[PDB]
Design an enzyme around this catalytic site. Structure first.
Site, PDB file in Angstrom:
ATOM      1  N   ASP A   9      58.732  -4.216 -53.017  1.00 12.16           N
ATOM      2  CA  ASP A   9      57.762  -5.309 -53.054  1.00 12.16           C
ATOM      3  C   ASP A   9      56.492  -4.741 -53.681  1.00 12.16           C
ATOM      4  O   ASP A   9      55.808  -3.914 -53.070  1.00 12.16           O
ATOM      5  CB  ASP A   9      57.521  -5.828 -51.611  1.00 12.16           C
ATOM      6  CG  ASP A   9      56.309  -6.734 -51.490  1.00 12.16           C
ATOM      7  OD1 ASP A   9      55.855  -7.295 -52.519  1.00 12.16           O
ATOM      8  OD2 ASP A   9      55.802  -6.873 -50.352  1.00 12.16           O
ATOM      9  N   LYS A  71      47.716  -7.070 -60.095  1.00 14.48           N
ATOM     10  CA  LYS A  71      48.761  -8.067 -60.197  1.00 14.48           C
ATOM     11  C   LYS A  71      48.209  -9.427 -60.653  1.00 14.48           C
ATOM     12  O   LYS A  71      48.941 -10.239 -61.233  1.00 14.48           O
ATOM     13  CB  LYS A  71      49.464  -8.209 -58.851  1.00 14.48           C
ATOM     14  CG  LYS A  71      50.795  -8.928 -58.925  1.00 14.48           C
ATOM     15  CD  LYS A  71      51.558  -8.789 -57.628  1.00 14.48           C
ATOM     16  CE  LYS A  71      52.663  -9.813 -57.486  1.00 14.48           C
ATOM     17  NZ  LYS A  71      53.427  -9.604 -56.229  1.00 14.48           N
ATOM     18  N   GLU A 176      60.159 -13.234 -54.906  1.00 19.06           N
ATOM     19  CA  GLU A 176      59.724 -12.903 -53.529  1.00 19.06           C
ATOM     20  C   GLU A 176      60.279 -13.826 -52.429  1.00 19.06           C
ATOM     21  O   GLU A 176      60.809 -13.338 -51.428  1.00 19.06           O
ATOM     22  CB  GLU A 176      58.197 -12.807 -53.453  1.00 19.06           C
ATOM     23  CG  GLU A 176      57.664 -11.571 -54.211  1.00 19.06           C
ATOM     24  CD  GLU A 176      56.163 -11.533 -54.432  1.00 19.06           C
ATOM     25  OE1 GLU A 176      55.397 -12.224 -53.700  1.00 19.06           O
ATOM     26  OE2 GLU A 176      55.743 -10.753 -55.328  1.00 19.06           O
ATOM     27  N   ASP A 199      54.352 -17.913 -47.049  1.00 19.52           N
ATOM     28  CA  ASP A 199      53.991 -16.517 -47.324  1.00 19.52           C
ATOM     29  C   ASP A 199      52.473 -16.347 -47.377  1.00 19.52           C
ATOM     30  O   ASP A 199      51.841 -16.587 -48.416  1.00 19.52           O
ATOM     31  CB  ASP A 199      54.620 -16.058 -48.644  1.00 19.52           C
ATOM     32  CG  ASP A 199      54.499 -14.551 -48.874  1.00 19.52           C
ATOM     33  OD1 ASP A 199      53.622 -13.899 -48.234  1.00 19.52           O
ATOM     34  OD2 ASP A 199      55.305 -14.023 -49.694  1.00 19.52           O
TER      35      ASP A 199
HETATM   36  N1  LIG Z   1      49.402  -7.576 -37.162  1.00 25.34           N
HETATM   37  C1  LIG Z   1      48.619  -8.294 -38.005  1.00 25.34           C
HETATM   38  N2  LIG Z   1      47.830  -9.329 -37.623  1.00 25.34           N
HETATM   39  C2  LIG Z   1      47.066 -10.022 -38.497  1.00 25.34           C
HETATM   40  N3  LIG Z   1      47.038  -9.729 -39.820  1.00 25.34           N
HETATM   41  C3  LIG Z   1      47.792  -8.716 -40.321  1.00 25.34           C
HETATM   42  C4  LIG Z   1      48.643  -7.934 -39.425  1.00 25.34           C
HETATM   43  N4  LIG Z   1      49.267  -7.001 -40.175  1.00 25.34           N
HETATM   44  C5  LIG Z   1      48.866  -7.176 -41.461  1.00 25.34           C
HETATM   45  N5  LIG Z   1      47.991  -8.181 -41.523  1.00 25.34           N
HETATM   46  C6  LIG Z   1      47.296  -8.664 -42.725  1.00 25.34           C
HETATM   47  O1  LIG Z   1      48.229  -9.054 -43.718  1.00 25.34           O
HETATM   48  C7  LIG Z   1      47.516  -9.017 -44.951  1.00 25.34           C
HETATM   49  C8  LIG Z   1      48.417  -8.371 -45.991  1.00 25.34           C
HETATM   50  O2  LIG Z   1      49.621  -9.142 -46.144  1.00 25.34           O
HETATM   51  P1  LIG Z   1      50.837  -8.557 -47.029  1.00 25.34           P
HETATM   52  O3  LIG Z   1      51.803  -9.678 -47.101  1.00 25.34           O
HETATM   53  O4  LIG Z   1      51.245  -7.205 -46.517  1.00 25.34           O
HETATM   54  O5  LIG Z   1      50.126  -8.305 -48.443  1.00 25.34           O
HETATM   55  P2  LIG Z   1      50.375  -9.023 -49.885  1.00 25.34           P
HETATM   56  O6  LIG Z   1      49.702 -10.364 -49.716  1.00 25.34           O
HETATM   57  O7  LIG Z   1      49.576  -8.096 -50.791  1.00 25.34           O
HETATM   58  O8  LIG Z   1      51.846  -9.095 -50.107  1.00 25.34           O
HETATM   59  C9  LIG Z   1      46.238  -8.217 -44.729  1.00 25.34           C
HETATM   60  O9  LIG Z   1      45.093  -9.058 -44.735  1.00 25.34           O
HETATM   61  C10 LIG Z   1      46.417  -7.594 -43.360  1.00 25.34           C
HETATM   62  O10 LIG Z   1      45.134  -7.403 -42.728  1.00 25.34           O
HETATM   63 MG   LIG Z   2      53.210 -10.475 -50.527  1.00 26.38          MG
END
Ligand SMILES: Nc1ncnc2c1ncn2[C@@H]1O[C@H](COP(=O)(O)OP(=O)(O)O)[C@@H](O)[C@H]1O
Ligand SMILES: [Mg+2]
Length: 382
Positions: A9, A71, A176, A199
């Site tokens: 990913d 990205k 995705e 998502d």
């Molecule tokens: N346990 C959690 N509770 C709330 N927010 C979270 C938790 N774990 C990760 N996040 C949040 O998820 C976000 C990242 O999402 P992710 O899907 O990993 O990234 P992307 O959007 O780059 O794919 C960040 O803002 C992070 O702070």
């Molecule tokens: Mg993502």
């Protein structure tokens, strides 16, 4: 000989890598112990390039020499109106070169470098590759890489090109939301079903309506918000504590950058804690003008501060349904993806939107995309 193919990913804010080993998907932790890695680049004064957690965690007064959110630019032309709007919000220099938005940074000793977006993404893939190689105890040459469903031909090709730069043969590009569905084994079902993928990530929010029939997915409709995610929830908490500190002390926190950076890191940690407990402490030694910071945040206050943003996520769901010619009761599966879906209130609101229907459960939502990539990588490794 493709060896052990990895599933990656390559995320806007956070990336993740998995592999199929001993009969299951294994999501691999990086050298800092984390199962996701920030899509982030920075430099030391000595001119060392940092990637991932070390880059994001480096304290700096010069954000213009960090690189992130590449990205948003990858596979686009410089004059793409999306690019011209995004560069307003990025602290680093973006310049027109070979028709594209290249990134220009100072890396140490007054040395200037210019990088294509796919060269930045290649650095992130390299870090993901190294993560997998450390786990496997051998080199990796081939990958399955995921992209947003809305990616066009240039964006897909540029993602493959990033792989090439990183020494990864990108064998398959998969969408995705489809990768998430695959993670939950929704491809291995009979009859035709409607799947809604919600998502909510770090900087981006994507909703997708997929149909699955006889093992074949179709992306019927997509929507979301290109600038809504957990970063915005963090900023609401930041504003809360900045205003309180001013009310308490008379001082305007924002005058000092490294202070804002420290509060942001602790606020993000607290937010994550509040997905599994009801109160969190935020503590920072020597916060501003030599004074320490010590405050608590309850889950209820976190929710109150962001309720309007949480509720705004339903509108794109309603739009994909109307564009799909579907009602709520037509949705057979709900799949939560993205780190911000760990927020209890976000889970609650999606379930209530669907009149009590439970989503899929059991895969960490910030890992589900890489998980599905790794499933496909397993088959390709043989
Ligand atoms: N346990 C959690 N509770 C709330 N927010 C979270 C938790 N774990 C990760 N996040 C949040 O998820 C976000 C990242 O999402 P992710 O899907 O990993 O990234 P992307 O959007 O780059 O794919 C960040 O803002 C992070 O702070
Ligand atoms: Mg993502």
């Amino acid at each position: 000989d493709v060896g052990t193919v990895v599933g990656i990913d390559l995320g806007t804010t956070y990336s993740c890598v998995g592999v199929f080993k001993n009969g299951r998907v294994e999501i691999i932790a990086n050298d800092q112990g984390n199962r996701i890695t920030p899509s982030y680049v920075a430099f030391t004064p000595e001119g060392e390039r940092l990637i991932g957690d070390a880059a994001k965690n480096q304290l700096t007064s010069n954000p213009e020499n960090t690189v992130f959110d590449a990205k948003r630019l990858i596979g686009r032309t410089w004059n793409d109106p999306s690019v011209q709007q995004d560069i307003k919000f990025l602290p680093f220099k973006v310049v027109e070169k070979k028709t594209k938005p290249y990134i220009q940074v100072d890396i140490g000793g007054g040395q200037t470098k210019t990088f294509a977006p796919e060269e930045i993404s290649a650095m992130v893939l390299t870090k993901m590759k190294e993560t997998a190689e450390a786990y496997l105890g051998k080199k990796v040459t081939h990958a399955v890489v995921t992209v947003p469903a809305y990616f066009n031909d240039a964006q897909r090709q540029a993602t493959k090109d990033a792989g090439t730069i990183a020494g990864l043969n990108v064998m398959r590009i998969i969408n995705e939301p489809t990768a998430a569905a695959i993670a939950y084994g929704l491809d291995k079902r009979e009859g035709e079903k409607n799947i809604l993928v919600f998502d909510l990530g770090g900087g981006t929010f994507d909703v997708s309506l997929l149909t699955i029939d006889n093992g074949v997915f179709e992306v019927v409709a997509t929507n979301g918000d290109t600038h809504l995610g957990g970063e915005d929830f963090d900023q609401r908490v930041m504003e809360h504590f900045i205003k309180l500190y001013k009310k308490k002390t008379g001082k305007d926190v924002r005058k000092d950058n490294r202070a804002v950076q420290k509060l942001r890191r602790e606020v993000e940690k607290a937010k994550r804690a509040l997905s599994s407990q009801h109160q969190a402490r935020i503590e920072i030694e020597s916060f501003y003008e030599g004074e320490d910071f010590s405050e608590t945040l309850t889950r209820a206050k976190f929710e109150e501060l962001n309720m309007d943003l949480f509720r705004s996520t339903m509108k794109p769901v309603q739009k994909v349904l109307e564009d799909s010619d579907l009602k709520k009761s037509d949705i057979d599966e709900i799949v939560l993806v993205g780190g911000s879906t760990r927020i209890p209130k976000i889970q609650q609101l999606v379930k209530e939107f669907f009149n009590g229907k439970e989503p899929s459960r059991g895969i960490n939502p910030d890992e589900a995309v890489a998980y599905g990539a790794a499933v496909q990588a397993g088959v390709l490794s043989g």
